[PDB]
Protein: Proteinase K
Organism: Parengyodontium album
Amino acid sequence: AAQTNAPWGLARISSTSPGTSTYYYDESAGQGSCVYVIDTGIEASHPEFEGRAQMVKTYYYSSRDGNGHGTHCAGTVGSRTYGVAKKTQLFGVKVLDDNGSGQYSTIIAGMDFVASDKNNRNCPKGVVASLSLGGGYSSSVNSAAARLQSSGVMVAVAAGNNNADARNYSPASEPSVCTVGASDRYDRRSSFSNYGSVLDIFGPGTSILSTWIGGSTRSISGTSMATPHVAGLAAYLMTLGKTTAASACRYIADTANKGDLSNIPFGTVNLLAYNNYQA
């Protein structure tokens, strides 16, 4: 399949080179897989989700995304126009309030929910969790992320938007999960993107167009935007039978675009997510 005039992020993950605008992907498109978007909620009624997104859990008075951040991340995972896995199933776990904030304890409960809720969902191709959140270092948030990874879910978390080493941030510093940094359309590390030895992969992070609340769209930046690229990429790759939940992050790194990014600090992987699709 070929999506012309796609967002630059989608075209980048299917390209050996930057500066293209067509997204190529196997038409399976993550069908039969699931991606949990653990964020502010998803506006599931957005026409871009085609009835494939739904709220499965909230810890607040409403499961509605009064923010837009979670809708934007879910749209990058699997919206028909802005998603990587355009046929995946999107499950919303609202752990962040409408201001984008949330207690670590609520975030931890949401991660343990997904580790159990996947046994209530039909995901024959496997389960992914996209965590476009993060804060200061916490061994309890990291361990919660390690449990979600251990339970059979491919966990992708943002490196952080502090332009520092991601070792001081959770769940970014959890080694067992996929810690995703951010890059821009010119194959530069995003100026805000965290780095370090804990980073596993880079995805498109700067000026990412995706869905927004109110049935709209907008372009925002963040490692919170690159994580749904890798999360949707994982789901796309598990549907194709190319990898599993336990080996997806390692697989994405093995098959990634190597040494194409600039301003990657010494000691950080120079790897860009790449779907390796040959049309």
About this structure: DSSP finds six helices and 15 strands in the chain.
